[PDB]
Ligand SMILES: CCCOCCn1c(=O)c(NCCN2CCOCC2)nc2ccc(-c3ccc(OC)nc3)nc21
Ligand SMILES: [Mg+2]
Ligand SMILES: [Mg+2]
């Protein structure tokens with residue numbers, strides 16, 4: 001819609017202070033879609049990206065709305081609000097968490113774009129579902145990070161779209177580099193890849209060998225940061241985290257519904273509304289096995305990222321209290 005673009009581009013963008021986007025404890029629940037878009041513009045602006053890379057205001061506005069409209073409204077969790085929340089946690093980590101200081105302008109540009117774009121056109125079903133249902137996507141990408149490849153494809157398609165070319169102001173070297181960072185950052189949101197690569201990260205920190213001047217370590221850090229931001233709802237104040245957890249479960253059970261009907265299987269516990277009683281012990285196991293070490297390691301990298309760790313620990317106890 002042209003009107004929606006014109007509304008957004010003509011709107012005054014409140015300050016980061018007013019929008020509370022620097023807060024790790026930030027919540028989007030009370031915000032309109034328009035307000036989420038204004039927040040996004042402010043993230044680009046206060047990370048000095050609109051200035052640095054000479055972005056036209058209307059081009060940025062169109063791109064944001066194009067990203068937003070390419071998330072599905074019938075997917076409970078992996079929708080625009082999750083993407084938006086991921087981007088906001090990135091902003092918070094960069095600003096209040098002091099990660100900005102450790103990265104180049106290009107890396108920040110690519111990280112912001114990847115956060116917003118990383119679940120584009122998510123269908124509300126997992127990679128394994130797409131593989132099982134012989135979807136053409138799983139065929140294109142050899143059953144490997146299927147959704148994530150698709151998300152990157154969508155990201156590129158929008159970046160290439162007339163009027164949406166927010167990177168048109170980059171030099172060729174910067175453009176190529178930025179696109180590569182974006183691709184690797186979006187792929188990193190496959191939790192399979194996180195598991196595969198996190199040991200190296202944890203051991204670099206343990207041996208005091210962590211050095212962001214190393215290109216390979218930089219890429220590794222960026223992947224870890226993406227996973228951290230992506231999973232950050234789990235670190236939110238209990239009532240916020242609890243509401244988002246309900247959405248996560250809704251999407252998982254919707255998939256299980258599809259699996260019963262389309263595949264005639266009993267879904268795995270994660271996907272099985274009939275076994276919703278497992279949610280709390282499953283949240284505890286997930287926090288222990290996946291989340292805690294990540295937020296610890298990030299705090300090791302920058303002590304100002306502690307609130308994510310604190311939040312995660314507090315929510316673990318709450319879930320454990322329900323489970324035990
Ligand atoms: C909440 C439903 C039950 O979830 C159990 C936890 N939980 C899981 O038990 C799980 N299991 C499958 C992981 N594998 C597939 C990929 O390859 C490796 C293994 N995946 C999860 C993914 C996201 C969240 C999640 C995100 C945000 C949030 O914010 C509040 N809460 C949870 N919670 C998850
Ligand atoms: Mg994803
Ligand atoms: Mg150059």
Ligand SMILES: [Zn+2]
Nearest residue numbers: 082118119230
């Ligand atoms: Zn995500």
